[PDB]
RNA sequence: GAUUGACAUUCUUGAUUUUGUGGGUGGUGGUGCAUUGAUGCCCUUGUUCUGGGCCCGCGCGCUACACUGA
């Protein structure tokens, strides 16, 4: 059940969510990014309103404990804002539930960086640079979930290729805007589901296949 | 509770700022109004009445006699593919696709370089118009103006009668195209107003006539604003009525002659090195 | 001497908040006695608007004289003392609105608090934001290149240095006096102050970028023993550069 | 729901310190964000986006909320509770 | 409406009314 | 599926009225309300004082 | 728009005063 | 019809008057928005969605 | 005669400057290293005056909401 990204021998699953937005504001007032408390300075800074949700992440926090191959821990994700900050999980991760325990888990981004468990050894979330083919191999298939390409199930998608060593995936956390789809890793991208989804569903769509093709 | 108390004592530190700013005022009022009239009195009535230069004298003098690179290596990839972005966005992109509709004039500047046909008369314009770009600082529409009549004239010399020098006009002309691309990527703004004048120019002259009062200056204007104008974009001020008007100028006459078989050969030959990319 | 209500317009005028110049300080340049009158009045009017208008009036009435008058004796000390009482050594925007609108006289500004800066114990920040406050306007050229080159035929200081080097990476044209102020600095920096002060390249801001768009009516033979001076220093960051920034001096 | 005094205020686990034992339970059950995150997933997913559904939500208090495919519920979660309450006492919101 | 909500504010745009009447 | 959004009011108080979008009038119905109320209870009390 | 309005607050003032002869805690 | 419990802790024994089925999705630990969103995607490969 | 405080349109100084081209867009910092030793990262363009939610419910009749429709 124990997995680093150091673990080549088998197949694995990455999901990394792009393009969010969580940068803290100090006004000694010490507040992150939210779209319900504080808008007047969101108004102020120009920023756009709709993008500023840690929701997003709060609720995609179903990838982490959903996969039934935690008996072999397959799961990692990975973050990514304009700041460019990156987060290593934990199959068997203990989360902060709620959002305001998650909310105020803020020094985690803007200065700490670096929690440990319950023995002090483990570093639970981390937050090595960029990019992560120096962590996962270049052995890993190519697909970001987007809207436009035909679509093709993760259960077909997975069953046809059986030894890599690992899957990727790259979701867009938005209200509207092109994300950087396939420039960096990608190059074709698997188009979502037949009606506008959303990143939780989104990330609920690839493993629900991941899991059914696996076979748990 | 203690947010009100604190709100009471910012107002009423604010109501004393500016009670003491009224009586500052009004205090300041009097005592300048009560004490000039005998302070200049005092004040008179009391009995009252270089190295640096000497450089910036020299500086001046020595100053008024005589009177890296890889951000600006990588500028080009960017500004590169900052075209290429606008580039597919002009293909797919920018202008909604919709609204369902259903210093001269042409003369003084050749007058000015009317010595000879290309080389000499184009270099003193190049000059003068160096001259007129250092020189005009309060009229650059006026700029734009002397380069729309340049470009009107530079396109009925480039088509006048080949029984000249044939190779070597031909490699004038190519450096002539190659600056006027060169000036295009500068100034575009009434290019493409002169661009329709003469499109209205040849719609006029086709209502007229059909082929007999058709200048060969179609053939260079259409082969200048295709080699220098990116023609890839979905629809352009520019290239597309003059595709259309191309397009009724393929297919619409009687081609009665050999003359205006070429026209057309070279027409289907410009049209493939237009939309080559799109 | 005064109309002895000058220590109640004092009391007030430290304190001030809103108003323009009154009846007094209108025509306090026109009077005649007005030293000994601000002396008595004893300026801790330190009020942000009766700082700038009065600052406003007399440099539109500051003479060299009236600069070695009124200017040497306490404003310095003030700025040491406002720097002192603050951790950071920061200014107020009384002090950079009076800066801004004092600077535009041209050889009296110079004297009156660029030229005494390096009277008493010249600091880096300080310096810094004197450079800062000094340079984003315009300077005039002539008077510009003379507070160089008297800084700089003056002997060497850190602070005053960092103001040097503010005023020669400004991006600023070029005389002959620029031209032998950097002849004798060169012939300064041998083994000297290179001996006595090792200058990284904390002080070598200057020396770093140095020529880009300066001469273009002289040699290269004062490139050339300056390039002998930084083969003469042994530095790794600065050396490669200093051939394509400063072979702009085209002859 | 608690009408305290002021107005109302939600029943969550981490919104106060002791209505749960005030009232006269556990607060190591008192949630309801599982429910928001759960009906909000179960609103996003494609068969209800095809229609396929109707959810009838509940408590302990024996009360049935049922409600419509086409709901679009608030994304937060701040804008949830104060929908909430507006469902449970006036019993009935439109579009 | 795709993947978001609603915004409004409170009575502070009857503030804003009121320093315009 | 068409998709609307539920209208409600930020901090509802079943016991306070609702938020009045028309200015012009919401004193009115505060007032034909109070006025209603007020009449009631000082009818109630001088017939109880005459009793 | 007006009429209604101030005779509602005259005739509120008119049963305010038939509250105030008599004492009538409200 | 699931009646999914929104339980955090305790026996689904709600609907122990009508249900008959017992059935889940694993023995291991997920939450109910998973539990939820793996029976809608259940349905969607059952009914072409 | 380009322009500065102006006996509120006025004479009183004066090279400090007028229409446009660029590039520096913004260093008065927070920050890891002795109390000042370009050591990773962020942002740009301080001020005359100014701000309050709160201790009607019950229910009897009458009436609307339903193709049993109009």
């Not at chain 2, 909604?96 to 509709?101: C, E, I, R, S, V």
């Not at chain 2, 000059?127 to 005009?136: E, N, R, S």
């Not at chain 3, 500051?62 to 600069?67: G, I, V």
Request: hydrophobic share 35%; charged share 30%.
């Amino acid at each position: 059940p124990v997995l680093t990204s150091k673990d080549k021998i088998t197949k694995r699953m990455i999901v990394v969510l792009a393009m969010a937005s969580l940068e803290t504001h100090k006004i000694d007032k010490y507040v992150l990014l939210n779209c319900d408390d504080h808008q007047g300075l969101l108004k102020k800074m120009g920023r756009d309103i709709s993008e500023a949700r840690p929701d997003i992440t709060h609720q995609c926090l179903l990838t982490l404990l959903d996969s039934p191959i935690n008996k072999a821990g397959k799961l990692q994700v990975y973050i990514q804002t304009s700041r460019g900050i990156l987060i290593e999980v934990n199959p068997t991760v203990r989360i902060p539930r709620t959002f305001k325990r998650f909310s105020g888990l803020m020094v985690q981004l803007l200065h700490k960086l670096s929690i440990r468990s319950v023995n002090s050894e483990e570093k639970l979330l981390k937050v090595i640079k960029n990019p992560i083919t120096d962590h996962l191999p270049t052995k890993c298939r190519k697909v970001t979930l987007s809207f436009d390409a035909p679509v093709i199930r993760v259960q077909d998608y997975i069953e046809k290729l059986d030894d890599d060593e690992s899957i990727c995936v790259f979701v867009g956390a938005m209200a509207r805007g092109k994300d950087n789809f396939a420039d960096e890793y990608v190059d074709e991208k698997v188009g979502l589901s037949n009606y506008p989804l959303s990143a939780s569903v989104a990330c609920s769509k690839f493993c629900h296949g991941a899991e059914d093709a696996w076979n748990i | 509770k203690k947010t009100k108390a604190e709100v009471m004592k910012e107002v009423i530190a604010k109501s004393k700022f500016y009670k003491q700013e009224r009586q500052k005022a009004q205090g300041i009022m009097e005592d300048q109004i009560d004490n000039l009239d005998d302070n200049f009195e005092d004040v008179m009535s009391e009995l009252m009445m270089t190295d640096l230069d000497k450089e910036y004298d020299i500086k001046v003098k020595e100053l008024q006699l005589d009177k890296k690179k890889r951000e600006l290596e990588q500028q080009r990839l960017d500004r590169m593919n900052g075209m290429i972005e606008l580039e597919e966005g002009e293909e797919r992109g920018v202008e909604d696709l919709d609204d369902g509709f259903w210093r001269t004039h042409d003369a003084l500047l050749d007058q000015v370089k009317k010595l000879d046909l290309d080389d000499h008369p184009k270099i003193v314009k190049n000059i003068i118009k160096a001259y007129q770009p250092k020189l005009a600082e309060g009229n650059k529409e006026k700029l734009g103006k002397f380069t729309a009549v340049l470009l009107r004239h530079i396109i009925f010399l480039s088509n006048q009668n080949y029984l000249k020098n044939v190779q070597s006009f031909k490699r004038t002309q190519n450096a002539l195209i190659s600056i006027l691309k060169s000036l295009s990527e500068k100034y575009n703004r009434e290019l493409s107003e002169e661009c329709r004048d003469y499109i209205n120019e040849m719609q006029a002259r086709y209502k007229k006539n059909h082929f007999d009062a058709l200048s060969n200056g179609d053939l260079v204007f259409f082969s200048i604003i295709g080699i220098l104008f990116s023609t890839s974009d979905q629809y352009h001020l520019v290239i597309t009525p003059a595709l259309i008007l191309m397009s009724q100028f393929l297919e619409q006459i009687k081609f009665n002659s050999l003359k205006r078989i070429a026209f057309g050969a070279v027409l289907v030959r410009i049209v493939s090195q237009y939309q080559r990319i799109s | 001497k005064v109309i002895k209500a000058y220590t109640t317009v004092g009391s007030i005028l430290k304190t001030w908040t809103h108003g323009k110049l009154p009846k007094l300080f209108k025509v306090i340049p026109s009077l005649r006695n007005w030293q000994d009158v601000i002396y008595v009045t004893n300026p801790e009017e330190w009020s942000p608007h009766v700082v700038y208008e009065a600052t406003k009036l007399f440099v539109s009435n500051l003479t060299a004289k009236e600069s070695q008058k009124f200017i040497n004796l306490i404003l310095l000390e003030r700025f040491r003392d406002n720097i002192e009482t603050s951790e950071d050594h920061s200014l107020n925007y009384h002090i950079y609105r009076a800066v801004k609108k004092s600077l535009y006289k041209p050889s009296a500004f110079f004297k009156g608090f660029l030229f005494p800066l390096v009277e008493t114990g010249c600091n880096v920040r300080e310096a810094t934001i004197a450079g800062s406050v000094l340079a984003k306007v315009s300077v005039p050229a002539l008077h510009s290149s003379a507070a160089l080159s008297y800084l700089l035929r003056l002997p060497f200081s850190p602070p005053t240095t960092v103001f040097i080097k503010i005023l020669l990476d400004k991006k600023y044209a070029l005389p002959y006096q620029t031209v032998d102020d950097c002849v004798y600095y060169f012939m300064r920096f041998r083994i000297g102050e290179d001996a006595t002060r090792v200058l990284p390249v904390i002080w070598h801001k200057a020396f770093l970028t140095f020529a880009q768009r300066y001469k273009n009516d002289i040699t290269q033979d004062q490139r050339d023993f300056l390039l002998e001076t930084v083969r003469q220093r042994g530095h790794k960051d600065i050396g490669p550069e200093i051939r394509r920034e400063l072979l702009a001096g085209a002859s | 729901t608690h009408k305290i005094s002021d107005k109302y205020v939600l029943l969550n686990c981490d919104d106060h310190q002791g209505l749960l034992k005030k009232m006269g339970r556990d607060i190591s059950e008192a949630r309801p964000d599982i429910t928001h995150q759960c009906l909000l997933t179960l609103l996003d997913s494609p068969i209800n986006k095809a229609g396929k559904l109707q959810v009838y939500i509940q408590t302990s208090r024996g009360i049935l909320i049922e409600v419509n495919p086409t709901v679009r519920i608030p994304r937060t979660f701040k804008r949830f509770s104060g929908l909430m309450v507006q469902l449970l006492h006036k019993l009935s919101i439109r579009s | 409406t795709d993947r978001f909500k609603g915004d409004d504010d409170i009575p502070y745009k009857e503030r804003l009314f009121e320093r315009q009447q | 599926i068409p998709t609307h959004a539920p209208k409600y009011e930020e901090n509802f108080n079943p016991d306070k009225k609702s938020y009045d979008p028309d200015r012009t009038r919401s004193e009115i119905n505060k007032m034909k309300a109070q006025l209603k109320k007020e009449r009631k209870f000082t009818m109630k009390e001088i017939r109880k004082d005459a009793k | 728009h007006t009429l209604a309005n101030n005779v509602e607050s005259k005739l509120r003032d008119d049963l305010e005063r038939l509250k105030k002869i008599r004492a009538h805690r409200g």
